Amino acid sequence: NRAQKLLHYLGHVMVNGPTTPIPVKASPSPTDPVVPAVPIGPPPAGFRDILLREGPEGFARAVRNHPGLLLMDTTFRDAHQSLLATRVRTHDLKKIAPYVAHNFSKLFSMENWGGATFDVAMRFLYECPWRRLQELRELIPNIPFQMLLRGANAVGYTNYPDNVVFKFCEVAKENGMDVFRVFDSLNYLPNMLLGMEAAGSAGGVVEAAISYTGDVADPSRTKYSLQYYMGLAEELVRAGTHILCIKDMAGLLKPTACTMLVSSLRDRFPDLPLHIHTHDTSGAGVAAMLACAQAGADVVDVAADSMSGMTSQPSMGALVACTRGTPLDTEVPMERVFDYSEYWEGARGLYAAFDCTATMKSGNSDVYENEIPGGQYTNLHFQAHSMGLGSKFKEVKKAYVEANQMLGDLIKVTPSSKIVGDLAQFMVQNGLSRAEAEAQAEELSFPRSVVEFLQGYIGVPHGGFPEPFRSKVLKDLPRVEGRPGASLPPLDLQALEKELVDRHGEEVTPEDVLSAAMYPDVFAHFKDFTATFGPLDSLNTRLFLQGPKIAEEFEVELERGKTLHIKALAVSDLNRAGQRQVFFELNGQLRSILVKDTQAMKEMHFHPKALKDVKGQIGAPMPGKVIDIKVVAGAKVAKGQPLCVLSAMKMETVVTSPMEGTVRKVHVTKDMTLEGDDLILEI
Amino acid sequence: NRAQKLLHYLGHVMVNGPTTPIPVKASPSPTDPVVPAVPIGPPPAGFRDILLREGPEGFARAVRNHPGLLLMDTTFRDAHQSLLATRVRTHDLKKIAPYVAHNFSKLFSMENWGGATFDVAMRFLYECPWRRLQELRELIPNIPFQMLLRGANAVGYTNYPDNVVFKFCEVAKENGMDVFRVFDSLNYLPNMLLGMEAAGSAGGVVEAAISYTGDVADPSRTKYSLQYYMGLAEELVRAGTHILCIKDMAGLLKPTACTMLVSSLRDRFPDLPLHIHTHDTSGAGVAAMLACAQAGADVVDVAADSMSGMTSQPSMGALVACTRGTPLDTEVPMERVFDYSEYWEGARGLYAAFDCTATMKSGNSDVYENEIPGGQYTNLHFQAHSMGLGSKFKEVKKAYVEANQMLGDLIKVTPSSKIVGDLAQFMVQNGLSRAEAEAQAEELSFPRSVVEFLQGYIGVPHGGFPEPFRSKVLKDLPRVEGRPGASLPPLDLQALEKELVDRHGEEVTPEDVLSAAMYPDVFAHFKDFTATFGPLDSLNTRLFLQGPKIAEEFEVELERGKTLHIKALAVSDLNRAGQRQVFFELNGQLRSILVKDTQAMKEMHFHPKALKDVKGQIGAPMPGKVIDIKVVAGAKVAKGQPLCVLSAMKMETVVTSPMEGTVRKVHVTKDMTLEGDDLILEI
Ligand SMILES: *C(=O)CCCC[C@@H]1SC[C@@H]2NC(=O)N[C@@H]21
Ligand SMILES: *C(=O)CCCC[C@@H]1SC[C@@H]2NC(=O)N[C@@H]21
């Protein structure tokens, strides 16, 4: 009963379309991604060998004592979150993972988990994220792995109790995660210290990421000054971080600001490794990374050349070529870069339904005025499409700016940017301005994320909440102040394990109860879907998003040894219950799949009958047209008296009543062409 | 391997259409024929009981001593030969045979075999005629059967040797035939005596049928006078016939001529039974039959009221009603007639593709000027449709009159009418008049039936052949005079049995070798078809001519006990070899049928290549357009010299020759937009 669920999925996708929401109506390309040649044998030695040999402090001293620029690949997580709405599957990553393991041994790390990959992998792709992590950990053994962990937000959207995040880092380090980049939205310091403690006690390398916004080189803006970042970095180094990081999530770091900030961090902490992360939204990413690498940055984040650009990271080939021959040489050969970007061009062609290039064709300097991050940009375009706002995204960006100013000049990264984007979609859908919605603040019903933020369930912003808005929206809802994670009670995780073993099965693991603690309803619907259709992980992307075509024999190997040569021969028409039939040739023998179509129902309405059991139910003895009614609705009549007269083709009849009674209502109007045995009078 | 051939037939009819030629593009009606209620038990006693009890002479004395008019039903043979091109199957006859056996016990006989039913049952319907005869002989035991046998023509179209017709009557009497109506086309007397001897020595009742033509009441026409019929009847009574018959095959008997001829035959032979057969083409059939029954006729031929009329027999209900209360009472109840005609209205609705009423909506008095018989009328319309003359049938009838006059005023019945109709289609297809084709008689190529008739292989006409035409068409072909059947050698029938057992199987019976003696190639193609698709006899007519529809469960019971509930679920698209696939649900399990489509082939042509193995094969290195040729076809050139120049999108190339040689031909013309690697010069 394994190929039957797969054929049910394939027929359901053929007849009804894909169960994924599709924002751009397009098909996957017929061209396959070209995987290059990989030398057979064990891969080279990398930085994970020195990590497992001498710990995180020796890893930090090795990355600090490396002559030249080090790179981190973000193609597996942040490139397709910025460009393809986080929709790239584990199949296309596993096809290129041995090439990366053989040829990119000199990388610092590789971000391939965390962010929005958790929620999208369970929600839209029907995959387990721990399964992707384990598969790529077997495939790439020589390069350290890196995950993007929020403060007390783990991989969710709100603050969690401490035991859940500690257990989350414990199990993620158990599965294979090496480097943990911990950041917070509002730069709220105890949430950062909590996330750093949870990441450090699990045994992993800690990368304390400071969220950057504004401009430190512009003295006109004084809220997030250079001294603000210097004090934040001083306290984060005082908590025992191993690598400091600057997360510029919108792409706002300019070369002068880069030189100023990295030189301040280098002459304040002379032996601490600096990592810079930026997006190339404004079009100045490679220039900013060259400014950082000359100012004293150690690791910078890149992506493959076909998977970089618009809202993504800077390009790997441009960073390799722009440092060739310099003292900052990365000594990576460019031909391996060419083959890797060749693969990702072929693989990006498969995801044309979620692609950024259907709307945005080049960069945009207006990110200097709306400050939207890139992953949020593509996921926000999808979310605005799925709520009817799919043709008003410029107004969503304008209300984005308005909602940033209205909520008190927040630092927008994931959670806070999700709050500002929810408020922007609310202000677009209800036509409200800034002052127009602050005047009606005590009347309107803001969404759960905005009201939950104004309560303070994610933390406290810099300079405090907007207190007139917080007084007008929150009437008497509880304002839990201080730290949200030090107030909420710990979830009994063995109770949740006991709650989940009696619903799905007995292969429920701690990874599953962490998936259900982070997302209860998404894990429930994911488990129901994978009960119905089974492991759709090992399908290719054209099969997953499009199904097969007629008379084209395709090969599916679900598990080890179990191979299936499947043809799709015909699709019938609809049955009595609105169901179609699909005919397959599975392993050479004919099989049949019955799938419910989803559009051919809910089309019926007509006039009711005249029920014969009651003599006071006067109906039409013959069809035609009501030409005159002789009764007043409310009086009573005798039997034999005329009530209504009807006419048909050369025929006219007068309706008589069979017995007495009070005329309740005249059910028929004037000149209503009714059928036979249809009710004209209730009596 | 029995349901597979049936499903192959059903899928072949679904995808490709019916293998029958269809003259009128229409579908069988969704209404089923309403079979009435039949009382359970043994049927009444009829005339076959007195036949089997006292022989043909006692049968003749019983039909001669019956007070009142006797009827013969022609609905099973002559009605659908006149109206539906002989296409009614054994299924629809078997559905009403027990009703006839229970309710029409007072019939004289029932014509249900012979005529064109043999050739059409093997050729277009894929049935054995002996199978129909045996099935209806089990179903109707109380009524004598009647067959229409030609002279020395048996059930064919030319004269046969004596042993074949004697064996034919032997086996037909063995199978269940009781009454044999023997007639000849030219009223050639020794062929009539041969057919009467073959029918009488087998042990059956002999009905000597005189073919009627012209008008005995009109003294202006003197060729077929009343004395001619009187002398013919005198010699046919002198040969020992049991029942005399007048076959008016075109419908030319008028009431005065009927009274004159039947009164002459009654006062010449006072104790011999007279049978009259007519068609209702002119619209005076019931009046003529009432005139015959009052003049002294004993049996008249009728048909069911929904299966009578236009070119068919007179109506049974009109004959029953017009003799009610008279001394000529038939004592048949009219309600049984109503139910029988109700069945045949429902069953005639199934044969809408072969129906007379698509062209002819009422009778026609022009049969007084063209003299076409009714069965020939419908079969001739089919034959003119299958030879491209389907829209020129009025010209076929005009050339019919011309070919009657041109061939010497023949008596037109089956063979002779087939000769005149072949000549009429020849004169329509070649635009010839009468004298225009007799002037070119020595030049043209008349068909095999006309030339074979002018040789005299069917017999000698009254007054001799047209001797200028017989001299001009026949140059030196052998004119076998006298009797054709007393000249030809007898066929070795055991040799033909030995020839047929080593081709099809070992269930080859004498009925099969008579079928192959009468029609060799039709029996061969019929045996190949029934080897491929099996016994298609037990299908209903909508299934046979139309196939099934999608998602409509139909029941087929091929043989005793073996029942099949078949659904048809889907039909795919075409394969590589142009074949479609049909999906069935046979007995509840899914089956697949692969049928060759017949239209999606024979579409390819383009320019040939330039073959690389020869250096003297100069072809186009790039596509484009020939703009100038610099060579003269015939001279020889050196290598490096320009030959042709070609242009494409912003590109122009000059063709050089690789070596020397003589330019044979310039293969390309001016401004021929050719492809790449396409030949421009042979050298
Ligand atoms: C669900 O659609 C997955 C994307 C949801 C929003 C994600 S979470 C990370 C990015 N930051 C943000 O505010 N939106 C993006
Ligand atoms: C074949 O199509 C069966 C009909 C062929 C002609 C038949 S034979 C009897 C009728 N008489 C005649 O001349 N044509 C009809």
From Swiss-Prot, chains A, B:
It comes from the Eukaryota. The keyword Lipid metabolism applies. Its cofactor is biotin; Mn(2+). One of its GO terms (biological process) is gluconeogenesis. Changing residue 116 to T: In PC deficiency; mild. The keyword ATP-binding applies. GO terms for cellular component: cytoplasm; cytosol; mitochondrial matrix; mitochondrion. Pathway: Carbohydrate biosynthesis; gluconeogenesis. It is found in: Mitochondrion matrix. Coiled coil: none annotated. Its EC number is 6.4.1.1. This is Pyruvate carboxylase, mitochondrial. It comes from Homo sapiens (Human).
